[model samples]
Target: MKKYTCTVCGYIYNPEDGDPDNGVNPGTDFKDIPDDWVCPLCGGGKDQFEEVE
Candidate 1:
């Protein structure tokens, strides 16, 4: 599974499930991040996502 981290807040996006507090969940595609979905910490967009090794 792919992993991502928020650049602004260091919030880790768990591939098992997207930001639950933002209504994003597992099976959601990175390209499909809802417009209302923002980083729980810094309220950033998909552009703030970075791959996690």
Candidate 2:
């Protein structure tokens, strides 16, 4: 899966690493993240994140 970044916090969401600290297990796709989950650092919503190359 590709990566995404929070426009508000610059937090990179890497599917390769996943967000285990926030209940997302390793290997999880970015699209699989629950809508309620926000950027861990800035609490930004998915709308605030954009696909990154």
Write one digit per residue (lDDT tens) for candidate 2, span 1-53: 99999999799999989999889998888888999999999988988999998
Q: List the residue pairs that clash in candidate 2.
A: none
- How well does each candidate superpose onto the true structure, as a TM-score? 0.71, 0.93
Tell me how many clashing residue pairs each candidate has: 0, 0
Q: Report every candidate's CA lDDT.
A: 0.77, 0.92
Instruction: Indicate the residue-level lDDT of 37 in model 2.
Output: 94
Measured by TM-score, how close is model 2 to the native structure? 0.93
Which 10-residue window of candidate 1 scores lowest in summed lDDT?
27-36
Question: What is the alpha-carbon lDDT of model 2 when measured against the actual structure?
Answer: 0.92
